[PDB]
């Protein structure tokens, strides 16, 4: 349940989401990584589901890193209400991902057990992915 | 089911009023500001509310005054 | 007396800023031409509306 301990403002604007990724396009902690090829929003619940599956397959084999964090919240309106009369209330926290960013990095295992722990975790995410190694 | 916001004050027309290289009179306002974001130069005065005005007739000149600071001056035309 | 510019496309549906550059050159209607000498300011007008006229 990743969520910032405190924020200055609880009602923000939504990110642009159009363009290419800004930073974090390389592997710097582990031996392998999972790279994204499309744009989408990632919620804390999705990150939780996608990392528990990876941990189970590896059987506590090595280290796993999460390079994304849901910094931005989003509001939602009640059910069956009319337009206007103020803004909604916080519902959850999301993160913006664009083509060329790494989501998960693992280390301490082989190249085969690592290519199967990331495939079982890429089906929990709403974005397309790819297998990438530390570039030589 | 209500809003707590919805207040705002009238907008003040701040900024420069004359351009560089332009001819002005003795009492022409050159820059309205809050505080001193641009300092007065030769033949220039700072008003009560930080307004910059000329004192003679001449061309306007926006120049730099030190590292990360600006001024405005007025030189008589010859 | 060095260049010849003729208007091929019309001005309907174009921004008002471009319709004013077609007036400084001396073009009234479609397919109208005019003769002027190659100046530094003359080519600055054609370049702005090079998608509408045909310089020769």
């Amino acid at each position: 349940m990743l969520l910032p301990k405190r924020v200055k403002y609880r009602r923000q604007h939504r990110p642009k989401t159009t363009g290419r990724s800004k930073g974090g396009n390389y592997v710097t902690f582990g031996e392998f990584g999972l790279q994204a090829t499309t744009t989408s929003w990632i919620t804390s619940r999705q990150i939780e589901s996608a990392r528990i599956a990876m941990t189970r397959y590896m059987k506590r084999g090595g280290k796993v890193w999460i390079k994304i964090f849901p910094h931005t919240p989003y509001t939602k309106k009640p059910l069956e209400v009319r337009m206007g009369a103020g803004k909604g209330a916080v519902e959850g926290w999301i993160a913006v991902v664009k083509p060329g960013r790494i989501l998960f990095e693992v280390a301490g295992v082989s190249e085969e057990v690592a290519r199967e722990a990331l495939r079982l975790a890429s089906h929990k995410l709403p974005v397309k992915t790819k297998f990438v190694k530390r570039e030589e | 089911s209500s809003t707590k916001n919805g207040r705002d004050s009238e907008s003040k027309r701040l900024g420069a009023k004359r351009a560089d290289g332009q001819f002005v009179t003795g009492g022409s306002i050159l820059y309205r500001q809050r505080g001193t974001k641009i300092y007065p130069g030769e033949n220039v005065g700072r008003g009560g509310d930080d307004t910059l005005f000329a004192k003679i007739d001449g061309v306007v000149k926006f120049e730099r005054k030190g590292r990360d600071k600006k001024q405005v001056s007025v030189y008589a035309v010859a | 007396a060095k260049l010849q510019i003729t208007l091929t496309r019309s001005v309907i549906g174009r921004p008002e800023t471009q319709r004013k550059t077609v007036e400084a050159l001396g073009l009234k209607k479609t397919n109208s031409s005019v003769v002027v000498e190659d100046n530094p300011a003359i080519r600055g007008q054609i370049n702005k509306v090079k998608h509408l006229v045909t310089v020769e």
Binding site: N25, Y26, Q35, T37, P99, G100, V132, E135 | - | -
Partner: protein
């Protein structure tokens, strides 16, 4: 066998650089000591393997305009999505 090279003359347009990368050739700049700033052209594959032997800091010995100059790789640009090198900087000590 020292690798081959080409000299980019003038200034290329956005399209010229894109078509050059499409062919399989990557642009490069050499600004090391003892040389001037000249734009060169080297095959992407020809560089990918010659760098294998010399490694990261080995001596390239690139030849510009019939004059071989001993040089090394200082920094380069890489595209992670399409996995295509974009730019290479050669530094001659």
């Amino acid at each position: 066998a020292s690798l081959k090279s080409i000299i980019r003359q003038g200034k290329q347009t956005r399209s010229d650089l894109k078509q050059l990368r499409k062919s399989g050739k990557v642009p490069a700049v050499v600004y090391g000591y003892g040389t001037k700033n000249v734009s060169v052209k080297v095959d992407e594959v020809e560089f990918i393997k010659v760098i294998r032997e010399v490694g990261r800091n080995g001596v390239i010995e690139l030849g510009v305009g019939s004059k071989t100059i001993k040089v090394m790789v200082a920094d380069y640009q890489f595209d992670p999505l399409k996995n295509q090198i974009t730019h290479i900087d050669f530094l001659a000590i």
